[PDB]
Amino acid sequence: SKDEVTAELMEKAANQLFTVLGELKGGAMKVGQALSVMEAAIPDEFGEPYREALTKLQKDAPPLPASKVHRVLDGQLGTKWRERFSSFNDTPVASASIGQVHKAIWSDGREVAVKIQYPGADEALRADLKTMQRMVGVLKQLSPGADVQGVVDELVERTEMELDYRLEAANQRAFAKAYHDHPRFQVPHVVASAPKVVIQEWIEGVPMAEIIRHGTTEQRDLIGTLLAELTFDAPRRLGLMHGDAHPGNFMLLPDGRMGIIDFGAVAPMPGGFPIELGMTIRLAREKNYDLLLPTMEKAGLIQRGRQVSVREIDEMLRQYVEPIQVEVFHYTRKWLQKMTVSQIDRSVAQIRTARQMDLPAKLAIPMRVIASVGAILCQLDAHVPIKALSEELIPGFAEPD
Ligand SMILES: Nc1ncnc2c1ncn2[C@@H]1O[C@H](COP(=O)(O)OP(=O)(O)NP(=O)(O)O)[C@@H](O)[C@H]1O
Known part of the structure; x- marks a missing residue:
């Protein structure tokens, strides 16, 4: 072929x-x-x-x-x-x-x-x-x-x-x-x-791979929403993350539950989801850079003691911020492709990245899982109420009030 x-x-x-x-x-x-x-x-x-x-x-x-x-x-x-x-x-x-x-x-x-x-x-x-x-x-x-x-x-x-x-x-x-x-x-x-x-x-049930290829809109939305929920519920519920996701690990059951069958890549998260992540995403959505940059530096999300570009920070948080700016986000391959397009062309400015290439384990583990899950949501072409899931399950994301 x-x-x-x-x-x-x-x-x-x-x-x-x-x-x-x-x-x-x-x-x-x-x-x-x-x-x-x-x-x-x-x-x-x-x-x-x-x-x-x-x-x-x-x-x-x-x-x-x-x-x-x-x-x-x-x-x-x-x-x-x-x-x-x-x-x-x-x-x-x-x-x-x-x-x-x-x-x-x-x-x-x-x-x-x-x-x-x-x-x-x-x-x-x-x-x-x-x-x-x-x-x-x-x-x-x-x-x-x-x-x-x-x-x-x-x-x-x-x-x-x-x-x-x-x-x-x-x-x-x-x-x-x-x-x-x-x-x-x-x-x-x-x-x-x-x-x-x-x-x-x-x-x-129906394998997630099959839903990715031939699924109905409702199947896609449902199993995508379930995967998104599992991702944040598991560390909250039992201090573990299902780990790096692959469509082969999941299925949609007749009663609308998601079956989960593979547990080889389970990752330890004793303290649950670290609060600095949800916090970072909320502050980035509000473009509160005054509080965002010290929060990220404290968390180890950016390198310490460096001149940082706000434009680059926006770019690196964009794939997390855009989905929660709406009630129901449509995860698409088109959107993910847009997320790979850099805002800063290197002929305009030659900066050294603010990104932390030595992430603390506590952050590195779930972020890697989330990346895999997000890519799967885009393959599913799923409509997911990630804003609500985030508010209820992710520490620090909800409005502090
Ligand atoms: N409870 C189950 N019911 C039905 N099929 C199952 C079940 N558990 C595993 N399988 C099948 O077993 C096959 C392999 O599953 P998996 O858990 O991924 O094993 P694995 O190959 O060792 N893990 P991986 O190396 O990541 O593929 C798949 O085709 C699944 O459909």
Whole structure:
């Protein structure tokens, strides 16, 4: 397809760009140069074990045949795992990132989704982690000016999150408890959890992806409004944010609730949504720069001790301010495109950004989630009463009175 191809080209462009970002901000040299160094500095004896980890994941490429599924189940729930089910469908209904999902019926009569991890995923991903740890070591020792601070920790945590299904299961349990019998959100309960098998209540509705492509106006508006609400309700309700959003994680149920099924990227927000954010947006809407700039500097939203352009502040807060200037905002791709257009052309003025490129975690985490959610709202073409949601759920945004 022409479009199929365009999507692939965009993906490759994005990966190229992030590779360049890694070279300029991390590795302190081009990937090819670094690779030549790495191959010289890493023993060839480590090459073939590496390969012999990636072998078996290639073996038995999707979907897994029934026997191997049953083998994984043997390993995780015991050889009499069948006794825990009323029935089990050997033909997978979906794919996961390093596994596949089966529909089944639990022993108590409930329908469940069973996510089964691919047998060779563990050793492959751990060997891959080992290789990247060695490469980080090479950069740290031999690449002058390299910044690899925190990188190994991030790789370890990502790997462990992918390989141990129990972590995601714990996150999901927190949410399932919090949103039990909620009038607008449905979180399936975790039925059982193991490192390589996780079982939860079966829910199905209209996938958000489907609503993005063919949804009615009312479907779009509804699921968009629900996502916006979840985003600000969750840290308020249980001190957690669902995390970076993706349409694959959500669905619209027949009764108008939003089903939420993926909890791998849950982010900690113990104190709830920080008040400085809602406060900043309110003060920016009123263009109260006298109070806005000190508030942002205090919060760490702008760099301290710098000459700041008010025009640039307006530009950086625009995507948050414009939606709450109306009762019901229409999130559109057209509008988002406008939000990417810079107010300050660099031939007019050469300023150094006031933006904080080292955001405090307390701010960085929810802001990243909000960005993902906002982009999804624009794909949905959703009409959302974000002003009212903000007034009720976001600390500091409502008129102080
Ligand atoms: N409770 C459920 N009911 C129905 N389908 C489910 C359920 N839980 C998961 N699925 C399906 O499982 C598949 C993978 O879901 P997901 O939770 O994203 O696993 P994952 O791939 O490990 N996470 P990710 O790496 O971000 O894609 C999707 O096609 C979902 O439709």
